[PDB]
């Protein structure tokens, strides 16, 4: 996929460039000049991560070093594109998440902060985490554990704490909290299993599990484990049914009768 995904992005960019002379250079410098998603993504992220104390051009090298050391980062990033193209009716182009969508930017920003975290460069990981919170309005602790094929749609107000886990193929909307409880260190954030769909505004708190292919109703406050393949809703949330599909993250059906 990752190779075909890149070629399509370049094809789309050539077309957009021709269509919009105000953005022709933007499309060229970010995408068309480049050979790989890595080069395009590092540019775009460095611009979002830009601060007075560490300009974009300096930031880009850090991003490039993470991408070179861990090939899985760029590849997750390509899987995250497909996920959003597939699940979001408002996105029908592969170049869109890469260029435009702050939830996508914050997610790949996270991957870089996480790599830093894992190298022991914790100050710099904290610095990136909090710049992303300011610039993308998404707050993901660098020690969170996040899989691939993830869609963060709209994303304003997403909060993902330190010991949170998000497995492959999860879809999360604006204003979702995967939050902690208490003042003590240790496991205290939710574990979101594969295929889970989380509607706008949901709050999930404590070290609790959300089982495979569960659906979390929009506006839910979840304080206890959610069984696999159930739909929950309410404040606090209770089981209200069973999702129409095996992996409700892929289908994005917001209804809660099930």
């Amino acid at each position: 996929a990752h190779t075909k995904v890149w070629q399509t992005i370049v094809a789309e960019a050539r077309e957009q460039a021709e269509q919009e002379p105000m953005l022709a250079s933007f499309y060229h410098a970010t995408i068309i000049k480049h050979d790989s998603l890595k080069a395009a993504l590092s540019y775009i992220l460095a611009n979002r991560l830009n601060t007075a104390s560490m300009p974009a051009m300096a930031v880009r090298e850090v991003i490039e070093e993470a991408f070179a050391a861990d090939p899985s980062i760029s590849e997750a990033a390509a899987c995250d594109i497909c996920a959003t193209v597939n699940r979001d009716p408002a996105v029908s182009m592969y170049s869109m998440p890469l260029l435009y969508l702050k939830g996508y930017h914050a997610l790949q920003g996270y991957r870089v902060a996480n790599w830093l975290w894992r190298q022991g460069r914790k100050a710099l990981a904290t610095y990136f985490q909090n710049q992303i919170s300011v610039a993308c309005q998404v707050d993901i602790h660098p020690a969170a554990r996040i899989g691939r094929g993830i869609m963060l749609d709209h994303a304003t107000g997403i909060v993902i704490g330190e010991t949170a886990v998000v497995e492959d193929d999860v879809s999360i909307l604006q204003d979702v909290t995967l939050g902690g409880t208490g003042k003590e260190c240790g496991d205290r954030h939710p574990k979101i299993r594969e295929g889970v769909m989380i509607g706008a505004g949901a709050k999930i708190l404590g070290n609790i599990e959300v089982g495979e292919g569960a659906k979390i109703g929009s506006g839910s406050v979840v304080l206890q484990a959610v069984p696999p393949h159930t739909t929950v809703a309410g404040v606090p949330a209770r089981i209200v049914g069973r999702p129409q599909s095996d992996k409700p993250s892929l289908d994005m059906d917001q209804q809660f009768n099930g």
Copy 2:
């Protein structure tokens, strides 16, 4: 109202300039030196939309182009000022929405992006949409249809999706979603009719009508059509009462069970 509004804005600006030497030049350059709201607003929005790849000065031209081609836009903008002064007790000056309020900026930004969208300049429309999301923390699809006399108070976390309709004289607080459902293209976002008030944090999802003068309680999750002149609250929302005025957007009474 249009020129009374402009003349009041200029008079307030002169007074504020005299009072705050740190901001005299800001008041002069945005307001006092200008003949219309168009020139003031193009300047202020240009600064909000500013990015590395397209600086304010180049952005201003695109804003001015939309204003010159569609006169209703700046008409709507003046109308939105009066909306905010009338409805929001924390705002007693006509220059305040214009100068300061990110909800106001996001909304006028949408008008320009919508104009772009309507000319087939969709990449630039998308560019502006997402820059506004980043800068004003309000995400409105440029294809959404929004009337006039709209107040977006505080505004952080507002999402309004592709096929949404918002009629004249609506009030919408922070963290409100007018959201979609499913992965399929097609009509899938709410239709908010005239006079509706939407309390903070409400989520409304799917292609459902919210009838004229309905009141959506704070924190509500709305999945079904709301009868006109009805008050809904809860997760998921149900009818809890009926508003006394025909247009609760005008009065901003946040109490429900009434």
Copy 3:
């Protein structure tokens, strides 16, 4: 506390400067160069409040004037750091709130805006409030009355309106609104007494008392006075339980009924 807090911040700063060469100069310029919290905080705050019309270097002088004229401001700033270290398991360094946390930045920003407001410098206070709202995604009316030992964790989407009161030792999470009701001037915003804990996404509206040591459940919509030492939750919120500690803000137990 004052001196011990600053000396600890300097020691951490020296330690971090040695671990991270990309940030050695950042740590030196903000912290290690300085002999008080005021110098460090004015610098960091100036950068966050930076706008085209009033650049950091200029803003910084305004912040310092406030710090010199009202010594209670830096003291409160010191107290809030301790509050965050003690209460947030993800923060174990005193220099972290100062340097990184937008909720912290926003709160100390409010303190400068409030001082300006108390001087009659209202245009500038409003300028500040709304820049903080855009840059930190926290919107606090400069006329709000806020005590000390306050933690705003994560903070995206926090709204605190004109007549709101927040006493000492309160903890408030992302997406919380202390909001108003109606279109008229007058007292209309919540009074949050000492010891209160407000979970993510809670909406409290109108001139209502939230009693000493109450806990407000995540996602709650509060329309009526909350008795002291009570836990409320729901949409609309009802009594679901009672906290065990006198000041649930100190413990951050998100559980309810609880």
Copy 4:
């Protein structure tokens, strides 16, 4: 010439845009999207004049105001383009002076500052003068009187003082001074008449005439009036020959002893 010049500039810009994808947006935003030289030039000069205290976008309005009030300014500007294309073998394109050459920018900058000066806006005139000195390394007093068909080639170190006069059709190379003498106010700068060429590094000092079609050799120091149609060279300069054309500014023959 005026609209042939503009139309040629637009045609060249379209070709350059096609050739250089890195600069397509630059060519479009400065030239291709515009109807006149005025709009192109106001954009380009605004960027050159940009400073912390007055950004390009605000500067553009002042430039456009001068252009609207005094039509001769943009007339002069087009005439200066043709001067540079005709006289300078390294320049074969009409868009080149407009886009690239700091001598050209400094000169059109002076026209705007001179307009300001003539309206009594002397602080802003002085602000622009000195910003041009810093940005273009050309220092022209706004009260100087400069005609049209002027070429400032390379331009670094050009100084032209308060009471200087430069007539139409003059050519002036880098490091040329039209300088004053004494500490007293009053007429004390050269009068350079029509057709004069001034070679690199020439210094001309005091209220002295340089007669029509005189040629000032490179490196000359001129302290006395120069007869029309005369060639001077040396430190201090003396007559060394006579030019064959009536207007050596047109031919740029740098040889002397002839």
Copy 5:
């Protein structure tokens, strides 16, 4: 003087502020808000010294530290203002060199680099020296020794090397070199004694003395000691007469018959 000079600057600034609304805030933030030349000068210099790697706000502290450690720096800076007001017919206001003139900026920038040099902070002094060369087009080695009452008029292209000395009351115009000879370390730059006037373009090379109250002809190349109270001119320079006055720096008479 230094006290009266400051009060006049504030009086002038209040007047300019009232005259030019585009610059009212600029005048307020730089001058009117302030109590001393130090505060105004550090602001203005920090803006000129601003680079990506060390923003203005960071630079200002370094400047302020030099001013606090060595009171003679601010006081020389006030004497340099008077010198230029007195000697330059184009400057009749005390606020002008401070705000506008790059030769003045470069000179006071030098004083700060020199203080750094003397403290052993040689990297930072070199960094400031070369930023001033880029931003003001004046290259003064931090180890140069420069007195007070100095006017650098127009200044483009001034070069003052490592072992150069400039005593009190010297006036230097654009494109003057006080330059070195050879490839060996040690004394190799000129010693400009008190009262000396140096015309535009002069080149003075080698460890040679220019005696009190000498006049250096514009465009002179000086390779041997110049006797006190003589006028030299030519390439290479010879004695052509005697200055009309005791201190030709004060009178600025460019004539060279004497």
Copy 6:
């Protein structure tokens, strides 16, 4: 030389990072992070060439493409560093030209512009040339032919035109012009052969030979071929003597007759 030069630069950099905490990160980001001159030089050059229309991060990719495509460019850059250390008594560190010296920046910038020009990318080469002229105050036509071991000391005002040739081991000071004559295309700029030294402010014009090992006196105006191993000086320049060394550029003896 290559490897030894880079290793020395890194060692100095480490040393300077420890002496100056304000610059530790600057030294790390430009030098210590990197394993070749190319990475360090591309970064520093990008920042100098930074413009609104093409920011540093984007420019950097263009510089690197040139460095990769033509290995002779970095080699020449290495050689020029050595030339400056050896010849300028005020430079004893190999990292100084790289980091600080605009003449060095401008020359290496020329090398990128020249490469672009040789690819047919002439708009971009012209864009670069003129940005260098504004930012470094050196104006070198991209079609000029320049060798290696070149020192441009101080550099303000240097002009080198289209058909100029500069062979290896040439030293050129501030305010030197290698300039053209006439309005026609064709060979018209000087040929400066190996070993030549050009003193401050010298003007050499027309398609004339400056022979191997010549010395050009400061302030000279050269209109005719200079024999090899000759010293010329004056306006216009005549033979005044003969250099003792074969390559006066290596020794920098400014004396004439000499």
